[PDB]
């Protein structure tokens, strides 16, 4: 339960205090991105550090389905988010003061929000779209992470430049919108 991953966060996202922990909370939903399932033959990733020392992840994948899980009785997309079982989203979302999700999948926007991994309101249809993929934007609890609160660029750059090596044929971006920075990691050999 997220409950036990509030209790102990240092057991599921690392130190909580020397900024480790906070960098690896952008990494874990990377991760993911990464791992999605491609919708067309490539893949682009979009990594924003937004001027309320917010991170987005977006990808232009199959997004994450939405249609009600049947034995849970809530979006896949939910239950994805809220729980447990490289160790998931719902971590960061528990770890995150506020997270936004925005999903787009067959022809259709749909938004949720949480606060500290509690859902504001059921997964909903906000309109309509010709997109797919899936976006995570999260706000850091400050109950959770101290002494070092504030996203650092180089650290996000270094290890998504180390990724995309890794990672043929996918498009990196990020982008500081605190100071305007950007940069590109698309490596194809
Ligand atoms: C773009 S962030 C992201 N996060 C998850 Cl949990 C799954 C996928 Cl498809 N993408």
């Not at 606060?115 to 249809?125: D, F, I, K, R, T």
């Not at 660029?153 to 890794?166: M, V």
């Amino acid at each position: 339960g997220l409950d036990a991953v509030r209790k102990r966060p240092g057991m599921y996202i690392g130190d909580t205090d020397d900024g480790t922990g906070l960098h690896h909370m952008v990494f874990e939903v990377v991760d993911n991105a990464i791992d999605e399932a491609l919708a067309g033959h490539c893949k682009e990733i979009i990594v924003t550090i937004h001027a309320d020392n917010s991170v987005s992840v977006q990808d232009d994948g199959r997004g994450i389905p939405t249609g009600i899980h049947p034995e849970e009785g809530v979006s896949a997309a939910e239950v994805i988010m809220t729980v447990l079982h490289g160790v998931g989203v719902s971590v960061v979302n528990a770890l995150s003061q506020k997270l936004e999700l925005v999903i787009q999948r067959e022809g259709k926007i749909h938004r949720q929000i949480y606060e500290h991994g509690v859902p504001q309101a059921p997964l909903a249809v906000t309109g309509e779209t010709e997109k797919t993929g899936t976006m995570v934007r999260f706000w850091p609890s400050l109950e959770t992470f101290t002494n070092v609160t504030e996203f650092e660029y180089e650290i996000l750059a270094k290890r998504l430049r180390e990724l995309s090596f890794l990672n043929s044929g996918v498009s990196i971006r990020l982008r500081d919108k605190r100071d305007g920075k950007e940069d590109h990691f698309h490596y194809e050999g």
